[PDB]
Ligand binder design. Structure first.
Ligand SMILES: CC(=O)N[C@H]1CNc2ccccc2C1
Length: 152
């Protein structure tokens, strides 16, 4: 049948919210109050892929926009991009591998590993107003843990 999707927001474990940074980038910043309306709402789709109790393959589309987070090689490195799709063939159950993240639940937090690039994670910087990126370790100064908030 159809693919199943949930609307949600994400915050990093330092409780930074995600906002648009021009058309094809996200950035993370500390937000509260009125400015919370700026945060990106995701449509998280539950897609085809290798699955276990704590590791669930998802696509992170933007709610009612034909824009997906995707993992591609850029200037020879795994990078995070926002990619446009045909709003007539998405969202689907069999999403292409560049769009798939393994949503991993460890110690009441979420990590989003690239299915295409093992051990590369959706990441934020500690500094305010810096891009969301794909980082090649769930260790060090960069932040790889998130919480999800469910949206109506
Ligand atoms: C123009 C703009 O920055 N809008 C925000 C708020 N709402 C929203 C909803 C879905 C996906 C992204 C967004 C970002």
């Amino acid at each position: 049948a159809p693919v199943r999707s949930l609307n949600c927001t994400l915050r990093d474990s330092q409780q930074k919210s995600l906002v648009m940074s021009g058309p094809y980038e996200l950035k993370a910043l500390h937000l509260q109050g009125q400015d919370m309306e700026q945060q990106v709402v995701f449509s998280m789709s539950f897609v085809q892929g290798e699955e276990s109790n704590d590791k669930i393959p998802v696509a992170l589309g933007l709610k009612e926009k034909n824009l997906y987070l995707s993992c591609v090689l850029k200037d020879d490195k795994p990078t995070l991009q926002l990619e446009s799709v045909d709003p007539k063939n998405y969202p689907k159950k069999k999403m292409e591998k560049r769009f798939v993240f393994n949503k991993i639940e460890i110690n009441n937090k979420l990590e989003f590993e690239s299915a295409q690039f093992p051990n590369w994670y959706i990441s934020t910087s500690q500094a305010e107003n810096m891009p969301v990126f794909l980082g090649g370790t769930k260790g060090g100064q960069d932040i790889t843990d998130f919480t999800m908030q469910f949206v109506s």
